[PDB]
Design a protein around this ligand. Structure first.
Ligand SMILES: O=C([O-])CC(=O)C(=O)O
Length: 181
């Protein structure tokens, strides 16, 4: 497995991912390869969070020696991740992306393939018809594996067993990117 970088949303914190971390450890990920960022700007502005994410990923690669990271992102964390890929230095550093209720369309409505010609970035976008915070048209990405679930609220995306199964599938290479390179 690649190291996993977990990216919180507006008003969030690294401890938002505590239950997802516990799940992944019981499914075979090493606790020492799971990394969750804490942004300073809790309002989610890309001009702050994009560069902070860039440096965090650089640090993770430097301390693990991995070639690429995988990303799990919640709400505005999805937009921050896409900004890093689109405008900054993330195009060749990411393999698998999973967004949970992502506010992705504030940056892109396309699953951006990145810049490694040997390997397109693969995406799973999970969103819920019961999400009262992020409308689903912001979460769906053309070219991704888009997964619509029902009955789970925006915060419960971080606890739901059904959501965790899709995270596992995405981190094991089960996302998609059917866009052109
Ligand atoms: O694009 C690159 O590989 C250079 C880079 O990540 C950085 O400036 O830290």
């Amino acid at each position: 497995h690649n190291p996993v970088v977990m990216v919180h949303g507006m008003g969030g914190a690294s401890y938002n991912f505590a239950s997802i971390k516990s799940y992944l450890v019981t499914q075979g990920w090493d606790r020492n390869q799971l990394f969750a960022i804490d942004f300073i700007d809790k309002t989610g502005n890309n001009r702050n969070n994009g560069p902070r994410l860039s440096r965090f990923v650089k640090d993770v690669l430097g301390k693990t020696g991995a070639k690429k990271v995988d990303i799990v992102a919640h709400s505005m964390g999805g937009a921050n991740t896409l900004y890093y890929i689109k405008n900054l230095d993330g195009g060749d550093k990411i393999e698998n992306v999973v967004t949970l209720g992502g506010a992705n369309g504030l940056v892109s409505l396309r699953a951006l393939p990145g810049t490694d010609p040997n390997q397109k970035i693969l995406y799973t976008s999970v969103y819920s018809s019961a999400d009262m915070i992020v409308v689903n048209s912001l979460s769906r990405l053309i070219g991704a594996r888009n997964v619509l679930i029902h009955g789970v609220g925006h915060i419960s995306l971080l606890a739901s067993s059904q959501v965790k199964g899709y995270i596992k599938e995405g981190l094991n290479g089960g996302g998609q990117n059917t866009n052109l390179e």
